[PDB]
Each structure stands twice: as C-alpha cells, then as structure tokens.
Amino acid sequence: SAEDKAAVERSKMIDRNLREDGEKARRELKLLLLGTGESGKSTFITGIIEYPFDLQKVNFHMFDVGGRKWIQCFNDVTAIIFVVDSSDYNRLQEALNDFKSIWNNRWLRTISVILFLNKQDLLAEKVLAGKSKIEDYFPEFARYTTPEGEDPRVTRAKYFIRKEFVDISTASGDGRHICYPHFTCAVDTENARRIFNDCKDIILQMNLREYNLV
Amino acid sequence: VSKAAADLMAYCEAHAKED
Amino acid sequence: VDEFSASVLTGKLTTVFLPIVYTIVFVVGLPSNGMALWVFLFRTKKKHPAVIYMANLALADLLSVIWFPLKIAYHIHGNNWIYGEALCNVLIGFFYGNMYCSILFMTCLSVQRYWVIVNPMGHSRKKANIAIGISLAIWLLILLVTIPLYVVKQTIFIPALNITTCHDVLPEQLLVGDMFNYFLSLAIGVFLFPAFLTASAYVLMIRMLRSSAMDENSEKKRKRAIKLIVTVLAMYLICFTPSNLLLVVHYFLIKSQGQSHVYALYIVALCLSTLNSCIDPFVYYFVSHDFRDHAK
Amino acid sequence: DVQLVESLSCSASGFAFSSFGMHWVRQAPEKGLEWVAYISSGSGTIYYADTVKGRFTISRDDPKNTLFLQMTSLRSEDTAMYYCVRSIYYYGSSPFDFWGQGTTDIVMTQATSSVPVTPGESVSISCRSSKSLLHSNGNTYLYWFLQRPGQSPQLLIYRMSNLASGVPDRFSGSGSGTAFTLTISRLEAEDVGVYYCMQHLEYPLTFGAGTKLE
Amino acid sequence: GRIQMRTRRTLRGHLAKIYAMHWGTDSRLLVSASQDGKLIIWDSYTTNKVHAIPLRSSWVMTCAYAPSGNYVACGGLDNICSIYNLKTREGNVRVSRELAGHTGYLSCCRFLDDNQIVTSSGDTTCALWDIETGQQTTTFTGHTGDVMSLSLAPDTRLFVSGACDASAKLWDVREGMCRQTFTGHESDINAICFFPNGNAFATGSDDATCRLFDLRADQELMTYSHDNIICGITSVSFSKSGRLLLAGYDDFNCNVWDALKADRAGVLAGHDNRVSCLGVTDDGMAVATGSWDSFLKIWN
Ligand SMILES: CC[C@H](C)[C@H](NC(=O)[C@H](CC1CCCCC1)NC(=O)c1ccno1)C(=O)N1CCC2(C=Cc3ccccc32)CC1
Incomplete structure (x- = not known):
C-alpha cells in the first residue's frame, strides 16, 4: 500500500492540474461560424480555422470547420454565428434553407444563432440602381412594406430579407433559443461588439431560465 | 443458412458455462 | 382573564376560522413542498446554487406545517391542549423557527439572483460551496434563536374556562420582559432586515431588466421574469409584514400600557404568514417549465 | 540518456524530474545499502531513515531539476557513498529505475x-x-x-x-x-x-x- | 432474463463532454477522450488517473488503446490521428507520430498492432497506416457519406465501418477492397462493433435502432428497437459472451439488449446527458460508459 499511496498522491496531482486547466477555459466563450461560400465569414471579424478575440476582458474562441454531423461537437457553445450574403438573391433561398437546417437542428435547440446579413452595401446599390428585381425570387416582396440617410427603397428590401429569416426563427424557437439578426459590411469593425452584447443577453437568458425567473 | 442462429445460440450456451 | 379574551378563546374566530385556514395550508403545503424536495434532492442531477437555496426553502416551509395537525385539533376542541407541555413547546418552536427560516432563505434567493443577473461573473462552480456554507449558517442561527421557545413554559391552565392555552395566554412577566425582547429581536432582526435585502434585491433586478441596455430580441422573455419578480416580492411582503407589524405593536403596548388585546389581531394576521408556506412552491419552483418536467 | 549527477546535491537531466519521487540511498565502504530518505512528486510527502530522522533533511526544487540533502550534525556513522535514485509511482510503473554515480520495521x-x-x-x-x-x-x-x-x-x-x-x-x-x-x-x-x-x-x-x- | 448493474465506480475529472473511451487489453487501464482537450488514462480498479495527456486539438472524436499498452491514439476535427508513447524513458507522455492525410475529420481509430493503425474519417474513406513512417499503406474508398465507426475482427484480418449513407462495409485489411455490403438503416449509422465470434457485427444508427449483420448472409438477422425509444444510438458494444448487447442512446441512458432475443433486458440510466461512448472489458467483468455529462461510470 506504500506504492498505492504514491499513486493516489499522483492522481490528486493530476486532478489539481485538471481543475486548474478547467478554470482557465471556463471563462472563455466558444463561438461557431457557419455560412455559405462567398460570404464574409473570414473577414467580418490547425485543420480547422481558429480565431480568438477578447472584448471587455471577456475572451472568445471562434471556430470555422473548413473540413453536417460534426455540428454535434459544437453543442453547448455560447452562440452560433451564421453569415449569409444578402446581396445574392439567387443563392439567398439556398442560404435560407441552410438557416432552417441549422435553426431546427436537434442538437442546436438551445443555441442562440447570431445572424449576420453581410454586405448590406451591395444590397443597397443592387436595388438602388434597379439593375435586378427581388420580386423574381420573392413574389411576396411586392406586398411587404417597411415598418421603420437610409434610402426608403433599400430599407424596405433590407428589412424584408431579415423578416424571412426571423420568421424562420420565431416559427419554432419558442423562446428556448433566439435569433439575433444584424446588418454589417466588410468594413464594419463593430461586428465584434455585436457578438459581445449578444452573448451577454444569451447568458442572461440562461441565468433567467436556470434560476427559475422564467 | 437457417441454422446459423441455432449455431450461434449453441455457441453462446456452451460458452456461458465458463463466462 | 378578561371577559373579552373569553369570547376570543371560545368564539368562532379561533374556534372556526383558524382551523379551516391551517387545514388547507397543511393539505396543499405539505405535499406541494414534499414534491419540491423530491425533485431537488432525488431527480436533480447537479447541485446548482439555485437548487441549494430552493431545496432548503422547501424544507423550511415543509417543516413549518408538519405540526399543524396538532394545531387543528387545538382549535376545534375549543383551544384545549391535551397533548401535554412537551409538544406545545416544539409546536411553537417549529412554527416560528421555520417560518422565520423561510424569511431568510427567500432572502438568499433574492440576493443570489441579484448577483447572478446583475453581475454575470460566472463563477458558479465555486458558488455551489458558498450556497451550502451560507445555508448552514442560517440553520444554525435559527436553532440559536429558537432555544428560548423550548426552555420557556408555554401551557397555562385557566380555571374559569377549563382549557389549556398552548401560547395564547401567558404570564405578564414573560410577555413583558422575556418575550418583549426575544420577539422584538426576532421581528426586527429576522424579518425587517432580511426584508430590506429582498425588497432591495428584487427592485434592482426589475430596474436592470427594464433598462434600455437590454437587447430587444429577449423582451418577451425578459418581461415574464419581471412579472415573476413582483409576484415573488409581493407575496413576501403582504404575507409577513402584517403579522410582524402587529407583533411589534402588540408587545409595545404590553410593556408601556399592558395592552394584551392586540393578540387577537395578530393571530389573524399570522394566517397570511402560514399561507405563504404553500404559496411559495407555486411561485418559486412550479413557475419554470423545466421543474414541472422533472415532476412529471 | 537519463542522467543523475551528484557532488549534498543531485542534478537531474534527461527526464521529467518533477514527475519522479526521489530517494537517497547511502553505502558505507562495505556495509550494503541504506535508504537515507524519500521525497514524493510535488514534495507532498517526505520520509527519513530512523538513523537520520530529524537529523537529516531532504529538499527538492522542480524548476532547476535539482535534489538536495543537508546534515544537521555529522557523525562518524555517516561516512558513506551517497546515491541519487529516482522513482515514479503509478499503476504499472517501475520505481527505483535509475541511480546516480554516487558521492563519496522489516529486517x-x-x-x-x-x-x-x-x-x-x-x-x-x-x-x-x-x-x-x-x-x-x-x-x-x-x-x-x-x-x-x-x-x-x-x-x-x-x-x-x-x-x-x-x-x-x-x-x-x-x-x-x-x-x-x-x-x-x-x-x-x-x-x-x-x-x-x-x-x-x-x-x-x-x-x-x-x-x-x- | 433481466440485467441490473450498479455503477460500481464513478470516474470524475473530465470537465467537458466525453466522446470516446477505449479499454486497455488488461481490462484495468482505460483511456477516455473529451472535448476538454485531455486524454486521461484511468485506473479502473482504484479510480486513479495514471496519465493526463494534453491534446493539441480539443475537438477529439475517438480514442484508442494499443493492444500492447505502449501507445494511445486520438483523432477528431483536426483531421489527424495522433499517436502517443506511454512508455517514454523520460517519464512523460509524448507524441510519437501524427497521421495526416485524411481529408475529413476522423471518427474512429483502432490499432491493429504497433506500427499499424486503421482510421476512419468523414471524407468517406478509411486508411490503414504505418506509424513508423506515417504513410497510408492502403485506402478504403467506397462510401458515399461520412464514416462513423470501426470494429476490428478478433483476428484483425478484417474490419467493418459504418457511414452516414446507412451502409456498413467489411474490408479486406491485406488487399484493400470491400468484401461485403450491408444496408437497411433508414438514417446515419453512428456506431459499429464486432460480435466476439468475428463473423458478425452490430450497427447503431441515428434512426433509433440497432441491427445485427452476419457476414455470411448480410441479411437482417435481428432488429433491436421499440416504439417507446425514438432516439438514435451513439455507441454500441458487446459483452464477452455475445448474448448481451449494450448501446448508448441519446435519451441519456444506455440500454442492454439480448442479442438473440432482440428484447431489451436492462438500462444503465446514471448519466444526465447523452451517452456517447460505451465499451466492455476484455475480461468481461466491467462495463465503462462515458457521456456528455462528463463522467465515466464503471458498471458491474
Ligand atoms: C399583560 C397581560 C398578559 C399578556 C396576559 N394576556 C395574554 O396572555 C394574552 C391573552 C390573549 C388571548 C386572546 C385574546 C387576546 C389576549 N396573550 C398574549 O398577550 C400573548 C400570547 C402570546 N404572546 O402574547 C393577561 O391578560 N394576563 C392576565 C391574566 C393572567 C395572569 C395570571 C393568570 C393566571 C391564570 C390565567 C391567566 C392569567 C395572564 C396574564
């Protein structure tokens, strides 16, 4: 038993280091990046691309799996970040279908999705110049009207594109997870703060749920 | 072909005595 | 005893109204808090800090009413105590000991929530220890203040009525110097100060959840918590302020005027405090959907 | 490969010194061997021989991979060859694996x-x-x-x-x-x-x- | 007959979801992997931790134990099967080789012996390597979906893999071509294991059913499912006898299944989250179980 006590001492030495490593990683928030190609996934902010950043003394660890069923591994992340090219109407429905698969995923029913409708400048000029008509792909746009400088026409189209995804979000969320749509460009430096504020509210909705306030 | 299940059952029963 | 007290001690107030109130509290409080301890201890897989305080609160409210089956018989029999001096001391001790314990554990939840919601620093791993550490410091304190309820004779026999009063009638000396300080310190120290934290903690939570700094996407779920904070705080105040306010007035006039007539108002105002023992499980535990899922 | 050099002090190189509990074993000119002391990984536990209990002290400092032994009061009984020996204790480990070059109850x-x-x-x-x-x-x-x-x-x-x-x-x-x-x-x-x-x-x-x- | 097992040990120390677990050949040592980024060697008998191996990539999906016990392997989203040396003269655990070459994430790794390991990946192919040089000696293309699990025969002459295409393929280790095609699952196959005879294997799919395929018939020998179980299987293992079949469901509890009667005969509900890994000792006297709860449990 003399050697067993030296082994039991070793396990506690291992356990001490295991606990001390956990407390370092507990304060760092994990984020998953998803989105179709030609989106600003890699610009708006190993075998799989990593990106760490910290705002207000809070560390974020952001993942982009270039190489879905690996999505299960990202259960219990702080928030999914989904980037979609709002300018390309032809591929928007394909991106809309992708967001449906992610939002109603079996293992993402508690993970809030931070949605970025990227490259809003390209959307503004595309309809501001009138070169292409959105109603070809979305007939219901002819009936939509904006509820809210910003040109009225681009804003009407801008909020219609969001409404399509938020309608997808609110149809099944039931308050377990919430989608947070945004508009951003490749030059928008505030895209990091949007994730920070959104993760504060994602954490708050978790404290409210687990402390029986909800 | 139909006796494969019976063969496996006999295998398990013979082995079970000395699990 | 005065002629008025005879009517109170034999009237429909204490003979009829109270036994009904304490009967329903026991029948809907004991099993409801009983199921609450079932989930918090058996089916809850982790010792989350909220579970620590809520489990203790369920215990405090459950223990407060276990002796009410003896109090129901006390009143229907005409305020006649046949179970001896021993059980009257524990029935008083458990009743005020747990009732004032609940006031403290609902102060732990109000302050526990305040730190988490307002300062999400997230060290919940180590706070599970603080919850048990704070939880024990309250049970011990409750025991240390419940001692005078056991070492003091309570049952008095009144020849003019042929009844024995467990707590309603006491000597003047006890009620004027011994209990004027045990209960004044109990109401001021174990209710008024904990009420300051619970009222302060929850109004600050409402102020934060109403702030414009919150994201508008959670407004629907953020305003449901606002209504539950007011529900929790309102039940805390209207169930314990009346009885505790009349307790200070009751014992204040006895020392200065010898006025013992206020006890009639206090016993009715104490019905609200016992009602809270069964209100809490429907306001703390059975409001969230996940807890109801575990119950099923 | 693995090296333990002595001159008392013992210098460790070529192995994870911090993960090994260390011993001191001494040898009179010809009287066999005697376990002077023992120190475990992390300096958690220390043992001494009955002949030097309290009189000798064993100390270890991981960062420089050096082991020490100090004598409170020398006696004619202590003239002996002193050896630096390593030992690691886990399930299948082999304690007392490596011995230094040396520096000049069950029976x-x-x-x-x-x-x-x-x-x-x-x-x-x-x-x-x-x-x-x-x-x-x-x-x-x-x-x-x-x-x-x-x-x-x-x-x-x-x-x-x-x-x-x-x-x-x-x-x-x-x-x-x-x-x-x-x-x-x-x-x-x-x-x-x-x-x-x-x-x-x-x-x-x-x-x-x-x-x-x- | 009914089976009841009573969590004789609880292995605590993982701080994230456990994803894979392999028993040592001595039925006492145990390696487990979690998203924490640590590959922990456990002393099952005393619940001691022999080694704690920091992984370069925390997104590990599989762990292996060398049959000699000298090495362990880890693989996952890093697209690499790392090999670790447990018998280093320096006393620490260090990487011996990194098996890069897979185009998708690795879902299962299994040592045939030293200097030979077979891995499966999400790129729809498996590869048989040598660790001395780190070159794929063989590749086993033929799947149309991500491969999820591997099971080496007792003679290690063949191995079976399951893919998201709801098909399981047996492979000739020494020749490289597929020798058998098995199908019937209505969704992804998520776990595969070998019946101890080596002439059969059990498949666990996301369609919430297990099924037994015999290499000599490739037919539906038995179907393990029930109306009240509507969730997939995450891990599948066999007892030493082969009469007892264990499977880790996403309903947070493993189910023991009579491999011949096809009827459930036990439950190992002791986890608060999805059961991910599950394996029986070579001795047959223990049954470890890991889950996303982040605790392993030895069941006897
Ligand atoms: C300062 C008066 C003193 C408070 C006492 N009154 C009470 O016991 C009231 C009674 C309460 C009943 C319901 C209606 C309201 C009044 N109960 C509390 O005040 C009470 C209970 C708990 N905490 O407080 C009181 O009138 N006398 C006078 C008679 C007395 C003296 C000798 C004696 C011999 C045998 C029998 C009674 C007595 C006891 C003292």
Whole structure:
C-alpha cells in the first residue's frame, strides 16, 4: 500500500492540474461560424480555422470547420454565428434553407444563432440602381412594406430579407433559443461588439431560465 | 443458412458455462 | 382573564376560522413542498446554487406545517391542549423557527439572483460551496434563536374556562420582559432586515431588466421574469409584514400600557404568514417549465 | 540518456524530474545499502531513515531539476557513498529505475556472502524477510539491484517478478510471501557484482546484506 | 432474463463532454477522450488517473488503446490521428507520430498492432497506416457519406465501418477492397462493433435502432428497437459472451439488449446527458460508459 499511496498522491496531482486547466477555459466563450461560400465569414471579424478575440476582458474562441454531423461537437457553445450574403438573391433561398437546417437542428435547440446579413452595401446599390428585381425570387416582396440617410427603397428590401429569416426563427424557437439578426459590411469593425452584447443577453437568458425567473 | 442462429445460440450456451 | 379574551378563546374566530385556514395550508403545503424536495434532492442531477437555496426553502416551509395537525385539533376542541407541555413547546418552536427560516432563505434567493443577473461573473462552480456554507449558517442561527421557545413554559391552565392555552395566554412577566425582547429581536432582526435585502434585491433586478441596455430580441422573455419578480416580492411582503407589524405593536403596548388585546389581531394576521408556506412552491419552483418536467 | 549527477546535491537531466519521487540511498565502504530518505512528486510527502530522522533533511526544487540533502550534525556513522535514485509511482510503473554515480520495521537478510560463478551457469540468488511482502493487491514489493565493481546499482527486478527495462532476459526474479529468489540463466561476464534485495511495503526501505558474486 | 448493474465506480475529472473511451487489453487501464482537450488514462480498479495527456486539438472524436499498452491514439476535427508513447524513458507522455492525410475529420481509430493503425474519417474513406513512417499503406474508398465507426475482427484480418449513407462495409485489411455490403438503416449509422465470434457485427444508427449483420448472409438477422425509444444510438458494444448487447442512446441512458432475443433486458440510466461512448472489458467483468455529462461510470 506504500506504492498505492504514491499513486493516489499522483492522481490528486493530476486532478489539481485538471481543475486548474478547467478554470482557465471556463471563462472563455466558444463561438461557431457557419455560412455559405462567398460570404464574409473570414473577414467580418490547425485543420480547422481558429480565431480568438477578447472584448471587455471577456475572451472568445471562434471556430470555422473548413473540413453536417460534426455540428454535434459544437453543442453547448455560447452562440452560433451564421453569415449569409444578402446581396445574392439567387443563392439567398439556398442560404435560407441552410438557416432552417441549422435553426431546427436537434442538437442546436438551445443555441442562440447570431445572424449576420453581410454586405448590406451591395444590397443597397443592387436595388438602388434597379439593375435586378427581388420580386423574381420573392413574389411576396411586392406586398411587404417597411415598418421603420437610409434610402426608403433599400430599407424596405433590407428589412424584408431579415423578416424571412426571423420568421424562420420565431416559427419554432419558442423562446428556448433566439435569433439575433444584424446588418454589417466588410468594413464594419463593430461586428465584434455585436457578438459581445449578444452573448451577454444569451447568458442572461440562461441565468433567467436556470434560476427559475422564467 | 437457417441454422446459423441455432449455431450461434449453441455457441453462446456452451460458452456461458465458463463466462 | 378578561371577559373579552373569553369570547376570543371560545368564539368562532379561533374556534372556526383558524382551523379551516391551517387545514388547507397543511393539505396543499405539505405535499406541494414534499414534491419540491423530491425533485431537488432525488431527480436533480447537479447541485446548482439555485437548487441549494430552493431545496432548503422547501424544507423550511415543509417543516413549518408538519405540526399543524396538532394545531387543528387545538382549535376545534375549543383551544384545549391535551397533548401535554412537551409538544406545545416544539409546536411553537417549529412554527416560528421555520417560518422565520423561510424569511431568510427567500432572502438568499433574492440576493443570489441579484448577483447572478446583475453581475454575470460566472463563477458558479465555486458558488455551489458558498450556497451550502451560507445555508448552514442560517440553520444554525435559527436553532440559536429558537432555544428560548423550548426552555420557556408555554401551557397555562385557566380555571374559569377549563382549557389549556398552548401560547395564547401567558404570564405578564414573560410577555413583558422575556418575550418583549426575544420577539422584538426576532421581528426586527429576522424579518425587517432580511426584508430590506429582498425588497432591495428584487427592485434592482426589475430596474436592470427594464433598462434600455437590454437587447430587444429577449423582451418577451425578459418581461415574464419581471412579472415573476413582483409576484415573488409581493407575496413576501403582504404575507409577513402584517403579522410582524402587529407583533411589534402588540408587545409595545404590553410593556408601556399592558395592552394584551392586540393578540387577537395578530393571530389573524399570522394566517397570511402560514399561507405563504404553500404559496411559495407555486411561485418559486412550479413557475419554470423545466421543474414541472422533472415532476412529471 | 537519463542522467543523475551528484557532488549534498543531485542534478537531474534527461527526464521529467518533477514527475519522479526521489530517494537517497547511502553505502558505507562495505556495509550494503541504506535508504537515507524519500521525497514524493510535488514534495507532498517526505520520509527519513530512523538513523537520520530529524537529523537529516531532504529538499527538492522542480524548476532547476535539482535534489538536495543537508546534515544537521555529522557523525562518524555517516561516512558513506551517497546515491541519487529516482522513482515514479503509478499503476504499472517501475520505481527505483535509475541511480546516480554516487558521492563519496522489516529486517531482510541474505544467507550467502559470496560465491564463485562462471559463464554459462544458472546461478540463483536468495533473500529473506521478516514479513510477508505479498500485499492484498496481489503485488509483492520486492526489488533487485546489481552493483558491479566501480558502478552504481542498477534495477533488475521490480515487485519481485517484473523485468526492468534495458535489462537482458537472463535475470528473472521469483518468490512468494517471504522467500524470494533471483535466477540468472546463461551467466555472462558482465553479471559479476554484488546483488541487493529491497522491500517497499513500509518505510524505511531496508536493504539486504549483499551477495558478492565472483 | 433481466440485467441490473450498479455503477460500481464513478470516474470524475473530465470537465467537458466525453466522446470516446477505449479499454486497455488488461481490462484495468482505460483511456477516455473529451472535448476538454485531455486524454486521461484511468485506473479502473482504484479510480486513479495514471496519465493526463494534453491534446493539441480539443475537438477529439475517438480514442484508442494499443493492444500492447505502449501507445494511445486520438483523432477528431483536426483531421489527424495522433499517436502517443506511454512508455517514454523520460517519464512523460509524448507524441510519437501524427497521421495526416485524411481529408475529413476522423471518427474512429483502432490499432491493429504497433506500427499499424486503421482510421476512419468523414471524407468517406478509411486508411490503414504505418506509424513508423506515417504513410497510408492502403485506402478504403467506397462510401458515399461520412464514416462513423470501426470494429476490428478478433483476428484483425478484417474490419467493418459504418457511414452516414446507412451502409456498413467489411474490408479486406491485406488487399484493400470491400468484401461485403450491408444496408437497411433508414438514417446515419453512428456506431459499429464486432460480435466476439468475428463473423458478425452490430450497427447503431441515428434512426433509433440497432441491427445485427452476419457476414455470411448480410441479411437482417435481428432488429433491436421499440416504439417507446425514438432516439438514435451513439455507441454500441458487446459483452464477452455475445448474448448481451449494450448501446448508448441519446435519451441519456444506455440500454442492454439480448442479442438473440432482440428484447431489451436492462438500462444503465446514471448519466444526465447523452451517452456517447460505451465499451466492455476484455475480461468481461466491467462495463465503462462515458457521456456528455462528463463522467465515466464503471458498471458491474
Ligand atoms: C399583560 C397581560 C398578559 C399578556 C396576559 N394576556 C395574554 O396572555 C394574552 C391573552 C390573549 C388571548 C386572546 C385574546 C387576546 C389576549 N396573550 C398574549 O398577550 C400573548 C400570547 C402570546 N404572546 O402574547 C393577561 O391578560 N394576563 C392576565 C391574566 C393572567 C395572569 C395570571 C393568570 C393566571 C391564570 C390565567 C391567566 C392569567 C395572564 C396574564
């Protein structure tokens, strides 16, 4: 038993280091990046691309799996970040279908999705110049009207594109997870703060749920 | 072909005595 | 005893109204808090800090009413105590000991929530220890203040009525110097100060959840918590302020005027405090959907 | 490869010093071996021999991979060769693996002082103990060391049956409870030396007398 | 007959979801992997931790134990099967080789022996390597979906893999071509294991059913499912006898299944989250189980 006590001492030495490593990683928030190609996934902010950043003394660890069923591994992340090219109407429905698969995923029913409708400048000029008509792909746009400088026409189209995804979000969320749509460009430096504020509210909705306030 | 299940059952029963 | 007290001690107030109130509290409080301890201890897989305080609160409210089956018989029999001096001391001790314990554990939840919601620093791993550490410091304190309820004779026999009063009638000396300080310190120290934290903690939570700094996407779920904070705080105040306010007035006039007539108002105002023992499980535990899922 | 140099202080290189508990073993000019002290990984536990208990002190500092030994009051009994020995304790580990070059209660005895040996023989060594080394674990905490002339002892067998790494198949320990043996099949020229047996059930780690093969 | 097992040990120390677990050949040592980024060697008998191996990539999906016990392997989203040396003279655990070459994530790794390991990946192919040089000696293309699990025969002459295409393929280790096609699952196959005879294997798919395929018939020998179980299987293992079949469901509890009667005969509900890994000792006297709860449990 003399050697067993030296082994039991070793396990506690291992356990001490295991606990001390956990407390370092507990304060760092994990984020998953998803989105179709030609989106600003890699610009708006190993075998799989990593990106760490910290705002207000809070560390974020952001993942982009270039190489879905690996999505299960990202259960219990702080928030999914989904980037979609709002300018390309032809591929928007394909991106809309992708967001449906992610939002109603079996293992993402508690993970809030931070949605970025990227490259809003390209959307503004595309309809501001009138070169292409959105109603070809979305007939219901002819009936939509904006509820809210910003040109009225681009804003009407801008909020219609969001409404399509938020309608997808609110149809099944039931308050377990919430989608947070945004508009951003490749030059928008505030895209990091949007994730920070959104993760504060994602954490708050978790404290409210687990402390029986909800 | 139909006796494969019976063969496996006999295998398990013979082995079970000395699990 | 005065002629008025005879009517109170034999009237429909204490003979009829109270036994009904304490009967329903026991029948809907004991099993409801009983199921609450079932989930918090058996089916809850982790010792989350909220579970620590809520489990203790369920215990405090459950223990407060276990002796009410003896109090129901006390009143229907005409305020006649046949179970001896021993059980009257524990029935008083458990009743005020747990009732004032609940006031403290609902102060732990109000302050526990305040730190988490307002300062999400997230060290919940180590706070599970603080919850048990704070939880024990309250049970011990409750025991240390419940001692005078056991070492003091309570049952008095009144020849003019042929009844024995467990707590309603006491000597003047006890009620004027011994209990004027045990209960004044109990109401001021174990209710008024904990009420300051619970009222302060929850109004600050409402102020934060109403702030414009919150994201508008959670407004629907953020305003449901606002209504539950007011529900929790309102039940805390209207169930314990009346009885505790009349307790200070009751014992204040006895020392200065010898006025013992206020006890009639206090016993009715104490019905609200016992009602809270069964209100809490429907306001703390059975409001969230996940807890109801575990119950099923 | 693995190195332990001494001059008391012991310098460690070529192995994870912090992960090894260390011993001090001393040898009078010819009186066998004696476990001076012991320190575990992380300096958690310290043991001393009854002869130096409280008089000697053992200290260890991981960052510079150095082990120390200090004497409060020297006596004529302490003149001896002092050895730096490493040991790591986990399930299948082999304690007392490596010995330094040296710097100038269970009782165990050996019935043999010295024997002549020739190559090609099958000589066997024997040892005795005052207690049953077979623990309820099924392990038997017996150890074997070979001290060739002018060389530090080297581990041959740990726990009475397990062949140490880097030692030829020739050596094979055996025993049961209290009676132990060490077989040397196909005796070769380099096998000439003094053989020591050791116990590790309880401290102090008492050594045997020493059988000098010629 | 009914089976009841009573969590004789609880292995605590993982701080994230456990994803894979492999028993040592001695039925006492145990390696487990979690998203924490640590590959922990456990002393099952005493619940001691022998080694704690920091992984370069925390997104590990599989762990292996070398049959000799000298090495362990880890693989996952890093697209690499790392090999670790447990018998280093320096006393620490260090990487011996990194088996890069897979185009998708690795879902299962299994040592055939030292200097030979077979891995499966999400790129729809398996590869048989040598660790001395780190070159794929063989590749086993033929799947149309991500491969999820591997099971080496007792003679290690063949191995079976399951893919998201709801098909399981047996492979000739020494020749490289597929030798058998098995199908019937209505969704992804998520776990595969070998019946101890080596002539059969059990598949666990996301369609919430297990099924037994015999290499000699490739037919539906048995179907393990029930109306009240509507969740997939995450891990599948066999007892030493082969009469007992264990499977880790996403309903947070493993189910023991009579491999011949096809009826459930036990439950190992002791986890608060999805059961991910599950394996029986070579001795047959223990049954470890890991889950996303982050605790392993030894069941006897
Ligand atoms: C300062 C008066 C004193 C408070 C006492 N009154 C009470 O016991 C009231 C009674 C309460 C009943 C319901 C209606 C309201 C009044 N109960 C509390 O005040 C009470 C209970 C708990 N905490 O407080 C009181 O009138 N006398 C006078 C008679 C007395 C003296 C000798 C004596 C011999 C045998 C029998 C009674 C007595 C006891 C003292």
